[PDB]
Amino acid sequence: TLGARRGLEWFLGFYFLSHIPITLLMDLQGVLPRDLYPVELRNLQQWYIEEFKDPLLQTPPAWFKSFLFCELVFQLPFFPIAAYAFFKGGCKWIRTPAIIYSVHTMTTLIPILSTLLLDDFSKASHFRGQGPKTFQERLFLISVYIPYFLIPLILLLFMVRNPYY
Amino acid sequence: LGARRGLEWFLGFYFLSHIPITLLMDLQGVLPRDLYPVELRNLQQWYIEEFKDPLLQTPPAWFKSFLFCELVFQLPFFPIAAYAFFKGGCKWIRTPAIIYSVHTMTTLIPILSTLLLDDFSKASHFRGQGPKTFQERLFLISVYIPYFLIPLILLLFMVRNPYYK
Numbered sequence: 001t002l003g004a005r006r007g008l009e010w011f012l013g014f015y016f017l018s019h020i021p022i023t024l025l026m027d028l029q030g031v032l033p034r035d036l037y038p039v040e041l042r043n044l045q046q047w048y049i050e051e052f053k054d055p056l057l058q059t060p061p062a063w064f065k066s067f068l069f070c071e072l073v074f075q076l077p078f079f080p081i082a083a084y085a086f087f088k089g090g091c092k093w094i095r096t097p098a099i100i101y102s103v104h105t106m107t108t109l110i111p112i113l114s115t116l117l118l119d120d121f122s123k124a125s126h127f128r129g130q131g132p133k134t135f136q137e138r139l140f141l142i143s144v145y146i147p148y149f150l151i152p153l154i155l156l157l158f159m160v161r162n163p164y165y
Numbered sequence: 166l167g168a169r170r171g172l173e174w175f176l177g178f179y180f181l182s183h184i185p186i187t188l189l190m191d192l193q194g195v196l197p198r199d200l201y202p203v204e205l206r207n208l209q210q211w212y213i214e215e216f217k218d219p220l221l222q223t224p225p226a227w228f229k230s231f232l233f234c235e236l237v238f239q240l241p242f243f244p245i246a247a248y249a250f251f252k253g254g255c256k257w258i259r260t261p262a263i264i265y266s267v268h269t270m271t272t273l274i275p276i277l278s279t280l281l282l283d284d285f286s287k288a289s290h291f292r293g294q295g296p297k298t299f300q301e302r303l304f305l306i307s308v309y310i311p312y313f314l315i316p317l318i319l320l321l322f323m324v325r326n327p328y329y330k
């Protein structure tokens with residue numbers, strides 16, 4: 001049947017494939033004009049921000065907004081190329097690109113996960129009551145961001161040590 | 166000499182000088198300043214007052230995480246990378262230097278974006294600590310931009326130089 005290395009490649013292929021609709025229809029609504037999005041998709045983002053209490057994608061600060069422009073200009077073009085590579089197999093030319101993507105993404109989420117778990121989101125802060133208030137509400141939000149840090153770390157370890165790449 | 170060997174000399178001097186820069190300056194906002202002598206505390210207070218640095222003294226959550234990354238991840242790599250480019254022809258530094266380059270570049274994209282585009286008034290969360298004029302934003306970007314360009318050169322150097330593949 002399928003192997004261990006090939007199984008991770010299929011799992012990584014769906015990660016890069018599913019990241020395309022997640023970036024376009026969700027994350028980029030904080031940097032791109034609202035008029036590029038239909039009303040049905042603009043309310044879907046608000047369902048997330050209200051339920052998960054996300055203070056970043058709601059109104060992005062300057063540091064978070066710079067990571068979103070990286071996702072549009074650098075990460076988004078790489079997603080289809082990486083998906084095709086790990087679905088086909090034997091594409092060694094992706095080793096250095098996948099390392100660059102992994103290290104970059106992981107470095108974007110260390111300040112994100114640190115802010116969501118340690119920063120203050122009360123009315124006295126600049127977030128002005130928009131954000132997780134309880135420890136359970138912080139992990140409920142960290143749960144959505146943690147797959148985008150763990151999966152790239154898996155890709156970094158895979159690329160550095162795999163002799164077939 | 167030559168451009169390649171000269172760049173390795175320049176890179177070695179970058180990683181060697183980054184050791185006193187990190188220990189004696191940048192880590193004063195992550196480590197307790199009781200461990201620093203009065204003179205080293207006063208030199209940082211001079212830089213914060215003269216250059217109007219809004220991040221180094223009282224770092225936000227996102228800026229603190231990078232300073233911890235600079236301590237746990239970057240500082241141990243500085244002597245190894247200095248030896249690799251001073252000696253020359255250390256092909257084992259390629260992937261480790263790529264990881265440092267993409268990490269440090271991703272660290273400063275939000276910093277440069279914040280210094281140039283964010284609001285540093287008395288009503289902002291920085292409480293008038295930052296720079297107001299465009300002139301001092303360049304005075305502050307000038308001390309942060311070499312840590313984006315030199316890692317950018319390193320990334321392009323390791324990706325294409327056949328003497329490290």
Ligand SMILES: COc1cccc2c1CCC[C@@H]2CCCN1CCN(C2CCCCC2)CC1
Nearest residue numbers: 022026027044048057071108109112144145148
């Ligand atoms: C039926 O379930 C759903 C339906 C609709 C949406 C969602 C779910 C399930 C859970 C919540 C999601 C909404 C996704 C929002 N997140 C996208 C990734 N983003 C990161 C990417 C990396 C760079 C930093 C930002 C963080 C935000």
Ligand SMILES: COc1cccc2c1CCC[C@@H]2CCCN1CCN(C2CCCCC2)CC1
Nearest residue numbers: 186190191212221231232235272273308309312
């Ligand atoms: C006699 O003049 C000097 C003497 C000593 C030092 C300096 C000067 C004058 C020029 C300024 C320097 C001090 C620079 C301080 N910066 C170092 C890099 N650091 C990191 C933060 C994390 C991301 C990477 C960059 C931010 C702070």
Ligand SMILES: CCCCCCCC/C=C/CCCCCCCC(=O)OC[C@H](O)CO
Nearest residue numbers: 307308310311313314315317318319320321
């Ligand atoms: C006293 C002040 C001291 C500091 C003063 C400021 C120094 C600015 C230096 C910039 C280096 C630029 C190097 C550019 C090298 C070529 C880039 C290139 O060709 O890039 C191709 C591209 O990356 C393919 O994707």
